[PDB]
Design an enzyme around this catalytic site. Structure first.
Site, short mmCIF file in Angstrom:
data_model
loop_
_atom_site.label_atom_id
_atom_site.label_comp_id
_atom_site.label_asym_id
_atom_site.label_seq_id
_atom_site.Cartn_x
_atom_site.Cartn_y
_atom_site.Cartn_z
CD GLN D 765 -2.19 -1.90 0.04
OE1 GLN D 765 -2.94 -1.26 -0.69
NE2 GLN D 765 -1.76 -3.12 -0.28
CD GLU D 766 1.57 6.72 1.58
OE1 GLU D 766 1.07 6.58 2.72
OE2 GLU D 766 2.67 7.27 1.38
CG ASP D 767 2.82 4.63 5.04
OD1 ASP D 767 3.11 5.33 4.05
OD2 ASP D 767 2.77 5.09 6.21
CB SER D 768 3.36 -1.57 2.20
OG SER D 768 3.69 -2.94 2.32
CD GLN D 903 4.38 7.41 5.87
OE1 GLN D 903 3.71 7.83 4.93
NE2 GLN D 903 3.84 7.05 7.03
#
Ligand code: ZN
Ligand code: ZN
Ligand code: ZN
Lengths: 129, 101, 65, 1023, 151, 114
Positions: D765-768, D903
Site C-alpha cells: 500500500q502507500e505505506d509498505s 515515508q
C-alpha cells in the site's frame, strides 16, 4: 468519593482558607520560635521538622510583602480558594501548563487572561542566587 | 464607528490675547464674520484655543458635515466648552474649540 | 564490512572481483573500465564494485585480544 | 589571474575542503571548552572576592593561580596513572582531569607582624575534559596513535564521558546581552518595552535586566490624559516603576537641560522633544539629586529605617545593580547616563515609528551557549559554595582562636560531584538550591549512526521560558540561511525547537575586547567624557560588546581601516564582527562569544579576491604548509555574523555577479562559496533536496538518524546498550560533494537496491514495500544487534553483600526457573555460548540475614551469542563487569525500510527470485515500492536518483548530488542512459514471475539507495 | 507573470496604483501581486494536466482520483507556486529584505518567495529556503492540528 | 512646539499666562526668571503625521552597498547619473509606498522625491 480535579471534597474544608508553602514556613517559624525559647517544653515532633524542610525547599517567596502581594493579586479574580494556594505553590510557567495541571481553572479562565496572571507570579517569586 | 481621530488631520493649542486677535492669519478671514454675533461673548473669554483641522478625504467617505461634528461635541460633552465651525466649501476645514464662558 | 560474496540481485560472484578491482584502479585504468575487464555487464553487479567501501581496513588497525 | 566560470565549480569545493580539514565538524564544541578551560576558569578564580574571617585574628585567603594537569586515574594506591578516554567508558567512570589551585593566606594577630605561607597546587578538585580538546589526551595525535588507544580516528569527539555515558552539551540559545531591544506587547499595561539585559564581561555578577517601558495612551485620567504618554523605568531591585527622568537626577544631572541633551541628540527635531515633555512633569517636583536618590530608595526591596540609608541603597543600586556592563566603579556616572539616554532615545524612535521594532526571532539578537559558556556559569556555583564551606568550616575554628588547616577547609566533593551531577542527570545547576533546573541539556550522545552523532554534537536548542514563549522559535526565519539547517528538525510536538548547526557555520569562541578598545583611542575616536552632548547629533555611535565607547567623526574611514585590520589578522581578530547601521549612524562591534557566523568570499569592485593562485596553493594544500587559515590572513575570505549579514550584500555564485544583461545589483560585497552549505549534516546527504518537498527533507532528517549502520570503527572494544551495525554498509551510487566532509562515505548506513516501482500482487500500500527473499538470503540488508549487560558486586551493607558465583539450587533458597549451566565457575558466561529465551548470563546473589538469587536474565527472548566479556573494578573499587550479547536479525515482513527520502515502508511481503518480475536481461528487482507513494508522500528525486543510479552503475562513475549544480539535469541524465542501451527515462519491460507474459506497463527500475531503520518487528514481538 | 508583477511594482513605486476603498495601499499591492502569481500557477498547472497523455501514469492516478491531486502534478511539472508564510508572502526577516542576497526593500517574485521552478527542474538556492519556510509552517500547523483535533 | 531653557537653572519653561498684561510668557517655576514667547504657539500635533521623510533620510546612505542604485534619475544640483533609492523606513508611512532618491556623490547629500 472525593476528587481535587472536580473540586469535590469534604464540606468541612470549605470554610478553611488555603495557605502557601512559603507562608506556612512563616507560621511554622512562629511556632518554632516560641517553643524554642518562650516555653521550656519537649523538642518539636519529627513531623513538624519534616514539613519545615519541605516548605523551605519549595518556598517561592522571600518575605511577607511578596506573599501578600500575590495573595491580594489573585484575590481580586474569581479564583477558587483551592486554586489560590495550588497555583502559587505549583507556579506554572505558562497558562497551558496550569490548565492541564489544574483542570478547574480551564473551566472559567481563558488562555489569555490566566497567562497574564502566571507571569505576574513569576515577577514576584525570586531566586536565592 | 468613527472617532474624531480618523476624521481629524492636525490639532494645536494657539494663544490669542483678545477675542478679536486671532493670531492665526489664515482663519482670520472667516472667524471674524462668525464671531460678530456675541455668542457666548457676554463676558471675558480665555485667551486659549484648541483649533483642530479636519481631513478633507475622510469627510467625503463618511459624508459628514461640520454642523454634525460640532453638534456632537457640544451635546456629547455638554456646556463645558463651545465650538465654532467654518464654511464647508473651504478647502481646509477649521474647527476651533474654547472652554465655555 | 567486507565485500559480499555474490550479487544480491542475480547471484553472480563479486567478492573475488574486489581484489582485482582495486588492483586495476592503481593500474591507471578508469573506474568503469575496470568493471568491464572483470566481466560485469549487468549494472546490478557493477554496483557491488563501483561504489563499495572496505571498512575492514580500518577495523584491522586496532590490535586484537 | 581569475577563476573562470567553467572552473569555479571545482575551485569552490576545494576551499571548502580546506575549511573542514583545518576547522573540522566539531570545532565549535572544542573551541568554547578550550576558552572556558584556559581563561574563564582562571577568571573565576582570579575574580573571586577576598575571603575574610573574624570573630583580633584576621585571615585573608586569596587564590593566586590555577594549574591543570592531564587526565589521570586515582586508584586505592593513589598513583597518578594516566586515564585513557576508552578506559572511562569501559569502567563506567567520569573522564576528567585534576584541578589544582594556589592558595596564599595572610594572617595578622594584631601584633604588627604580617606573615604568609605558600600552598603549592592545592587539590581543589577536578574538571571534566571534553574529548579531543586542548587538555584531552588525544590532541594533536596522528591517526596511527588513536588506533593503538582503541579510539576511532574518524570520531570527532567533542563530548564528555560521565559515569561511562557520553554526553553532549546541547547549545541553548539566549537573548543577547548588552543590547537594546524594543518590542510591542498588546497585553501589557504599557505600549512599548525598553528591554535591555546588561551584563559585564564573561560574567562578574548575575545578569541584570531593566525594562524602560512607556505607558500606553489607552488609560485616561484628569492628569494622565493631559501629559498623556510618559516613560517609566523599573530598576532591578525596585519593585515599583520609577520615572526614567528621576534616574538621571540620581546620577548627578540635576539640570533638566542635561537630561534632554543625553536623550535628544537633535534639538532641531521637535517630534521627539514633545514625547519627552510628559516624562519631565512626573519628575519635576524632584529637583535635587539627593531627593532623587531618596525617591528611588523609598520603594527599594529593603528600605532603610533611617532617611540617610535610603540614599545609600539607591546609590549602590544605580552604581552597581543598574547597568553593570557600562560601569562598575563609582566614577562612571557620565558613562551610565549616556547609555541610559540611548535606551530612551531608542524607545523614542520606535514609538514615533521612524525605527523598526526589533525582531524577536532575529538570531543576531540571540546568543548561543556552548559547553564552554555553560560550564563557566556552573563553575561559579560550586566555587561560590566552596568559599562558603571554607568560611563556615573556619568560622568555628576562628572563634576558638586556633588556626584552621586548609586541607580540611577545601571540599573536593562539591567541585567534582557538582559538575558530574548535572552533566549526568541533565538537570542544570545545583540540586540543593531551591529552584527548577533546566532539563534537556547534556543528553546522551546518539551513537546509532555516525551522521546522527555529528548532528547531535552540532544540535541547537531554542530558548525556553518567557523569551521562547513570546517568540516563534518553531517557525523558520530568514536569518537561518547559512547558519542553521532549515530542513533538519525533529518531527512531533517539539518541531523547530531543536535544530542543527549549518555545515560551514560556526559559533564565535570569544575574545577580549581590550585590543579593540585601545585601537580606537589612538585614532580620531573620542570618548563621551571628553565631548559635549551636542557632538553626538552628527557623529556615528561606536559600540564594543554593547559598551558606549564614544562617537566617531568620520565613520567611512574608520570602518575601512577596521575592515583592513580584520582581513590582515591584526590586533582585531577575524572572529570579531563589525556592524554598520547606516540608517541609524550606529557602528556596532561585538567580541563576546556565542555569535554564530559563517565564512564568505569577499568581493571588491565586482571582482572576487580569491584568484587562481590561491586555488592553486589549495590544490596542493598538503606538504606545502598551506591551510584555510592562510586564506583569512590574505583577506580573501572573512566571517560575517547575523548582525553584519544585515548590512552585507551577498551573491549566490560568481556567474551572478560577473555580468548580467540588467544589473540587479552593481555593488556586491561578499559572495557565497556554494549555497548547498546551508544544509545540515542530515540534510546534506540528500540528493536534489530542492527537487524534494520540504516536509520530506525534514522527515529524512529524523529517518537518517534512525538509520542503522557503522557508527564508528572501534565498536568491538566499546560496550553500548544499543548498537546496530550493518553487514554490508555500501557507499551510495549517488553521493553529494558535502558527503565527503561528513565522512558518511567511509561509514555509510544503508545498502543500494535496484528498486522497480510497480504494484506487484497488491501486497504494498502507500505505506509498505515488497522485498526479494533470495536477495535477503545473500545478505541484502542483514545487520547485527548488540546489547550490553552490566552488573557489579558491591558491599553496600556490612551484613549483606553481593558476590559473583554459580547460584546452586542447594546453597540458594530463592531462585527463578531457568537454565544455569551457561554460567562458569566465576558466575560469568564465557564468550561463544549461544543464549536463547530466558537464560541467566551473570550470577549474582545477596547474603541476606542462605542467599537470595538476584541474577540478571536476558531483556528479551531473542536468541543471541555473547560476543565478549569484560571484568573491571568500578570507581568505588568493587568488582564490575560488562558483557555484550550479539544477535543476528534477518530482515523479514515486519521490518521497516525507508528510502533516503519519503515515508518509511514496511516490507509487505518477501518473494523469491523466481516470483519477482524479471526484465529482459534477467534482473529481478531487489525491492518493489508502491507507485502511489510518489505523488504526495515521496519526491521526484527518487525517480531522478534511480535514473542517476542507473547511469552511474552503467558508466562506472559516482553521480554528483549537489543540490544546486546546473550541470546535473534530468534531460542530461536521460541522454547518458540512452547511450548504454537503456530507456532514456529508465523504464524497462518487466516479465511477471508467475506468468511469463509481458506486463502491459513498462516498469521503472533503478539502483536507489536505501537504509534500514532501527524499528524492527523482532524487537517489538520479543518484548 | 513576472513582468506583470514588475509593472504592478512600478505603478506603486510611482504612486500610479490606486488603493481599493476597502483596503490600504500596502495591503492592496500584496493582493494584486498574489493574484498574478496565484493565477499563473493555476493556468500553468491546468495546462500540465492537459499535457499528460492517457498512457501517462500521472494522469491515471488523478483521473481515477485514487491518490494525489492536480496541484501535486502542477508543483512537479509546471511550477511549485508561491510559498506563503503565516498567510502572507515571505516576511522581511532582515531590514526590508527577505534574504541578504536580495536588495533592500525588494518586493519582486524571487525576493518574496515566489517559486517559479518545478520540482523536476530544481529550485534555486533562494527558493529552497523559502520552500522550507512554507513547509515549516505546515509541519507546525499539522503538529498542533492533531493535538487540538484529538482534544 | 519647541522647548526653551531658562538661563538661571536650565529647566523646563512651561507656558504661563498673566492676567495683567494679557501676554503669554514662558516662565520657570523653581526660579523666578520668566521670558516672553514671540511664537504665540504652545504646541502642535499632526494626527495623520504626514511629515516629509526627506529630512529624516540621512545623506550618508550613499555608500550603502545593499541599497539599490539607479541611473534613471540624476541629482538635481550635481547631474550625476547614479542615484541610490529606497522605500520609506518609517512604520507610520508603511501603509504608503514611495521612493526616495539620494545623490551618490561623496559630498552632495541631496535628497529629493519624484
Ligand atoms: Zn548482479
Ligand atoms: Zn528656571
Ligand atoms: Zn548631488
Amino acid at each position: 468519593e472525593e476528587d481535587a480535579s472536580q473540586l469535590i471534597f469534604p464540606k468541612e474544608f470549605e470554610t478553611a482558607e488555603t495557605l502557601l508553602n512559603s507562608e506556612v514556613h512563616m507560621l511554622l517559624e512562629h511556632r518554632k520560635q516560641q517553643n524554642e525559647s518562650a516555653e521550656d517544653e519537649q523538642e518539636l515532633s519529627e513531623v513538624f521538622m519534616k514539613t519545615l524542610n519541605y516548605t523551605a525547599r519549595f518556598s517561592r517567596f522571600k518575605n511577607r510583602e511578596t506573599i501578600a502581594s500575590v495573595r491580594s493579586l489573585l484575590l481580586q479574580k474569581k479564583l477558587h480558594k483551592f486554586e489560590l494556594a495550588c497555583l502559587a505553590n505549583l507556579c506554572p510557567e505558562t497558562a497551558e501548563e496550569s490548565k492541564a495541571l489544574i483542570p478547574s481553572l480551564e473551566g472559567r479562565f481563558e488562555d489569555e487572561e490566566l497567562q497574564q496572571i502566571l507571569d505576574d507570579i513569576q515577577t514576584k517569586r525570586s531566586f536565592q542566587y | 464607528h468613527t472617532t474624531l481621530r480618523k476624521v481629524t488631520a492636525n490639532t494645536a493649542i494657539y494663544y490669542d490675547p483678545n477675542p478679536q486677535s486671532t493670531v492665526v492669519a489664515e482663519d482670520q478671514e472667516w472667524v471674524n464674520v462668525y464671531y460678530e454675533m456675541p455668542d457666548f461673548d457676554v463676558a471675558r473669554i480665555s485667551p486659549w484655543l484648541l483649533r483642530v483641522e479636519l481631513d478633507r478625504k475622510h469627510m467625503t467617505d463618511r459624508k459628514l458635515t461640520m454642523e454634525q461634528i460640532a453638534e456632537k461635541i457640544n451635546a456629547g460633552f455638554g456646556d463645558d466648552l463651545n465650538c465654532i465651525f467654518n464654511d464647508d466649501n473651504a478647502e481646509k476645514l477649521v474647527l476651533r474649540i474654547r472652554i465655555m464662558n | 564490512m567486507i565485500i559480499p560474496v555474490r550479487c544480491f540481485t542475480c547471484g553472480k560472484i563479486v567478492g573475488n572481483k574486489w581484489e582485482a578491482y582495486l588492483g586495476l584502479l592503481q593500474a591507471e585504468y578508469t573506474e568503469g573500465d575496470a568493471l568491464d575487464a572483470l566481466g560485469l555487464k549487468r549494472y546490478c553487479c557493477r554496483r557491488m564494485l563501483l561504489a563499495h567501501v572496505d571498512l575492514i581496513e580500518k577495523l584491522l588497525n586496532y590490535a586484537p585480544l | 589571474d581569475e577563476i573562470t566560470p567553467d572552473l569555479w565549480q571545482e575551485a569552490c569545493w576545494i576551499v571548502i575542503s580546506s575549511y573542514f580539514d583545518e576547522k573540522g565538524l566539531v570545532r565549535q564544541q572544542l573551541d568554547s571548552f578550550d576558552e572556558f578551560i584556559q581563561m574563564s576558569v582562571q577568571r573565576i578564580v582570579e575574580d573571586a572576592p577576598p575571603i575574610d574571617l573574624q570573630a583580633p585574628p584576621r585571615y585573608l585567603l586569596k587564590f593566586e593561580q590555577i594549574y591543570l594537569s592531564k587526565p589521570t586515574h586515582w586508584e586505592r594506591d593513589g598513583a597518578p596513572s594516566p586515564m585513557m578516554p576508552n578506559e572511562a567508558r569501559l569502567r563506567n567512570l567520569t573522564y576528567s582531569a585534576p584541578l589544582y589551585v594556589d592558595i596564599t593566606k595572610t594572617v595578622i594577630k594584631e601584633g604588627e607582624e604580617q606573615l604568609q605561607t605558600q600552598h603549592q597546587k592545592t587539590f581543589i578538585g577536578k574538571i571534566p575534559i571534553m574529548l579531543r580538546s586542548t587538555y584531552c589526551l588525544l590532541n594533536g595525535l596522528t591517526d596511527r596513535d588513536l588506533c593503538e588507544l582503541n579510539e576511532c580516528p574518524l570520531d570527532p569527539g567533542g563530548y564528555f564521558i560521565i559515569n561511562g555515558s557520553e554526553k553532549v552539551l546541547i547549545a541553548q540559545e539566549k537573548m543577547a546581552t548588552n543590547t537594546v531591544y524594543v518590542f510591542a506587547k498588546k497585553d501589557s499595561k504599557y505600549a512599548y518595552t525598553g528591554e535591555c539585559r546588561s551584563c559585564l564581561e564573561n560574567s562578574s555578577r548575575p545578569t541584570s535586566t531593566i525594562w524602560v517601558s512607556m505607558l500606553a495612551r489607552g488609560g485616561q485620567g484628569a492628569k494622565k490624559s493631559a501629559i498623556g504618554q510618559r516613560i517609566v523605568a523599573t530598576l532591578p531591585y525596585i519593585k515599583q516603576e520609577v520615572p526614567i527622568i528621576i534616574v538621571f537626577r540620581a546620577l548627578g544631572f540635576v539640570s533638566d537641560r542635561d537630561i534632554l541633551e543625553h536623550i535628544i541628540y537633535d534639538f532641531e527635531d521637535p517630534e521627539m522633544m514633545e514625547m519627552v515633555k510628559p516624562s519631565l512633569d512626573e519628575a519635576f517636583v524632584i529637583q535635587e539629586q539627593n531627593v532623587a536618590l531618596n525617591f528611588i530608595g523609598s520603594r527599594g526591596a529593603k528600605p532603610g529605617v533611617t532617611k540617610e540609608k535610603r540614599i545609600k541603597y539607591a546609590k549602590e543600586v544605580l552604581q552597581k545593580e543598574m547597568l553593570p556592563h557600562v560601569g562598575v566603579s563609582d566614577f562612571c556616572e557620565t558613562k551610565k547616563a549616556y547609555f541610559l539616554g540611548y535606551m530612551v532615545h531608542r524607545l523614542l524612535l520606535a514609538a514615533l515609528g521612524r525605527r523598526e521594532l526589533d525582531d524577536r526571532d532575529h538570531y543576531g539578537n540571540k546568543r548561543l551557549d556552548l559547553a564552554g559558556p555553560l560550564l563557566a556559569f556552573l563553575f561559579r556555583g560550586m566555587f561560590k559554595n566552596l568559599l562558603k564551606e571554607v568560611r563556615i568550616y573556619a568560622q568555628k575554628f576562628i572563634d576558638r582562636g586556633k588556626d584552621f588547616n586548609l586541607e580540611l577547609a577545601i571540599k573536593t566533593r562539591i567541585i567534582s560531584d557538582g559538575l558530574k551531577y548535572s552533566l549526568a542527570t541533565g538537570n542544570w545547576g545545583d540540586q540543593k538550591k531551591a529552584h527548577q533546573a533546566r532539563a534537556g541539556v547534556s543528553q546522551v550522545l546518539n551513537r546509532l549512526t555516525f551522521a546522527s552523532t555529528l548532528s547531535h554534537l552540532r544540535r541547537l536548542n531554542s530558548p525556553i521560558g518567557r523569551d521562547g514563549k513570546l517568540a516563534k522559535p518553531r517557525q523558520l526565519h530568514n536569518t537561518l540561511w547559512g547558519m542553521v539547517c532549515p530542513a533538519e528538525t525533529p518531527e512531533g510536538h517539539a518541531v523547530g525547537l531543536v535544530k542543527n548547526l549549518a555545515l560551514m557555520a560556526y559559533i564565535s569562541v570569544g575574545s577580549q575586547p581590550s585590543p579593540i578598545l585601545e585601537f580606537l583611542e589612538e585614532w580620531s575616536m573620542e570618548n563621551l567624557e571628553e565631548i559635549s552632548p551636542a557632538a553626538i547629533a552628527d557623529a556615528t555611535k561606536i559600540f564594543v560588546n554593547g559598551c558606549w565607547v564614544g562617537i566617531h567623526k568620520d565613520p567611512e574611514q574608520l570602518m575601512n581601516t577596521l575592515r583592513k585590520l580584520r582581513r590582515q589578522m591584526d590586533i582585531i581578530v577575524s572572529e570579531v564582527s563589525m556592524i554598520r547601521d547606516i540608517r541609524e549612524r550606529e557602528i556596532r562591534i561585538y567580541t563576546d562569544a556565542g555569535r554564530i557566523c559563517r565564512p564568505l568570499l569577499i568581493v571588491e569592485k565586482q571582482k572576487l579576491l580569491l584568484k587562481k593562485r590561491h586555488i592553486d596553493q589549495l590544490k596542493e594544500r598538503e606538504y606545502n604548509n598551506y591551510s584555510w587559515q592562510d586564506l583569512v590572513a590574505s583577506g580573501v575570505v572573512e566571517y560575517i555574523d547575523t548582525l553584519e549579514e544585515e548590512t552585507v550584500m551577498l551573491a549566490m555564485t560568481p556567474d551572478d555577479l560577473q555580468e548580467k544583461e540588467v544589473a540587479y545589483c552593481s555593488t556586491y560585497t561578499h559572495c557565497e562559496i556554494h549555497p548547498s552549505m546551508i544544509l545540515g549534516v542530515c540534510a546534506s546527504i540528500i540528493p536534489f533536496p530542492d527537487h524534494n518537498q520540504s516536509p520530506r527533507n525534514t522527515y529524512q532528517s529524523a529517518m537518517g538518524k534512525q538509520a542503522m549502520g557503522v557508527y564508528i570503527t572501534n565498536f568491538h572494544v566499546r560496550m553500548d546498550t544499543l548498537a546496530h551495525v550493518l553487514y554490508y554498509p555500501q557507499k551510495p551510487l549517488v553521493t553529494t560533494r558535502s558527503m565527503e566532509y561528513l565522512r558518511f562515505r567511509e561509514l555509510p548506513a544503508g545498502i543500494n537496491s535496484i528498486v522497480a516501482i510497480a504494484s506487484y500482487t497488491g501486497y504494498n500500500q502507500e505505506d509498505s514495500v515488497i522485498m526479494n527473499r533470495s536477495a535477503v538470503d545473500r545478505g541484502f540488508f542483514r545487520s547485527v544487534f548488540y546489547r550490553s549487560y552490566k552488573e557489579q558486586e558491591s558491599k553496600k551493607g556490612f551484613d549483606q553483600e553481593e558476590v559473583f558465583e554459580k547460584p546452586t539450587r542447594e546453597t540458594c533458597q530463592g531462585m527463578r526457573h531457568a537454565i544455569y549451566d551457561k554460567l562458569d565457575d566465576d558466575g560469568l558466561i564465557a564468550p561463544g555460548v549461544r543464549v536463547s529465551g530466558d537464560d541467566v548470563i551473570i550470577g549474582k546473589t545477596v547474603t541476606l540475614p542462605t542467599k537470595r538469587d538476584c541474577s540478571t536474565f536476558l531483556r528479551t527472548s531473542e536468541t543471541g551469542i555473547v560476543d565478549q566479556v569484560m571484568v573491571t573494578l568500578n570507581q568505588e573499587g568493587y568488582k564490575f563487569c560488562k558483557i555484550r550479547v550479539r544477535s543476528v536479525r534477518i530482515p523479514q515482513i515486519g521490518d521497516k525500510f525507508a528510502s533516503r527520502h519519503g515515508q518509511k515502508g514496511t516490507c509487505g511481503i518477501q518473494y523469491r527470485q523466481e516470483d519477482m518480475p524479471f526484465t529482459c536481461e534477467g534482473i529481478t528487482p531487489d525491492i518493489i515500492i508502491n507507485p502511489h507513494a510518489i505523488p504526495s508522500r515521496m519526491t521526484i528525486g527518487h525517480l531522478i536518483e534511480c535514473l542517476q543510479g542507473k547511469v552511474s552503475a552503467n558508466k562506472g562513475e559516482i553521480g554528483d548530488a549537489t543540490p544546486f549544480n546546473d550541470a546535473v539535469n534530468v534531460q542530461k541524465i536521460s541522454n547518458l542512459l540512452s547511450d548504454y542501451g537503456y530507456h532514456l527515462r529508465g523504464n524497462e519491460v518487466l516479465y511477471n514471475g508467475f506468468t511469463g507474459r509481458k506486463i502491459t506497463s513498462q516498469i521503472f527500475i533503478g539502483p536507489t539507495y536505501y537504509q534500514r531503520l532501527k524499528h524492527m518487528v523482532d524487537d517489538k514481538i520479543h518484548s | 507573470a513576472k513582468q506583470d508583477v514588475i509593472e504592478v511594482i512600478e505603478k506603486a513605486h510611482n504612486n500610479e496604483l490606486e488603493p481599493t476603498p476597502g483596503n490600504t495601499l500596502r495591503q492592496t499591492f500584496e493582493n494584486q501581486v498574489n493574484r498574478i502569481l496565484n493565477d499563473a500557477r493555476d493556468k500553468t498547472g491546468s495546462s500540465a494536466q492537459k499535457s499528460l497523455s492517457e498512457y501517462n501514469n500521472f494522469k491515471s492516478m488523478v483521473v481515477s482520483g485514487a491518490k494525489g491531486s492536480k496541484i501535486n502534478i502542477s508543483q512537479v511539472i509546471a511550477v511549485v507556486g508561491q510559498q506563503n508564510v503565516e498567510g502572507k508572502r515571505i516576511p522581511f526577516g532582515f531590514k526590508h529584505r527577505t534574504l541578504p542576497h536580495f536588495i533592500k526593500d525588494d518586493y519582486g517574485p524571487e525576493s518574496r518567495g515566489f517559486v517559479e521552478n518545478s520540482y523536476l527542474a530544481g529550485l534555486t538556492p533562494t527558493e529552497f529556503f523559502f520552500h522550507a519556510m512554507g513547509g515549516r509552517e505546515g509541519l507546525i500547523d499539522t503538529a498542533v492540528k492533531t493535538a487540538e483535533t484529538g482534544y | 512646539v519647541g522647548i526653551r531653557f531658562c538661563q538661571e537653572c536650565n529647566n523646563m519653561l512651561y507656558p504661563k499666562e498673566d492676567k495683567e498684561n494679557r501676554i503669554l510668557l514662558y516662565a520657570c517655576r523653581n526660579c523666578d526668571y520668566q521670558q516672553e514667547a514671540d511664537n504665540s504657539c504652545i504646541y502642535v500635533n499632526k494626527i495623520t503625521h504626514e511629515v516629509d521623510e526627506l529630512t529624516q533620510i540621512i545623506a550618508d546612505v550613499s555608500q550603502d552597498p545593499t541599497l539599490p542604485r539607479t541611473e534613471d534619475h540624476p541629482c538635481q544640483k550635481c547631474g550625476h547619473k547614479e542615484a541610490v533609492f529606497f522605500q520609506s523606513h518609517s512604520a507610520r508611512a508603511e501603509d504608503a509606498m514611495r521612493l526616495y532618491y539620494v545623490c551618490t556623490a561623496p559630498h552632495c547629500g541631496h535628497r529629493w522625491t519624484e
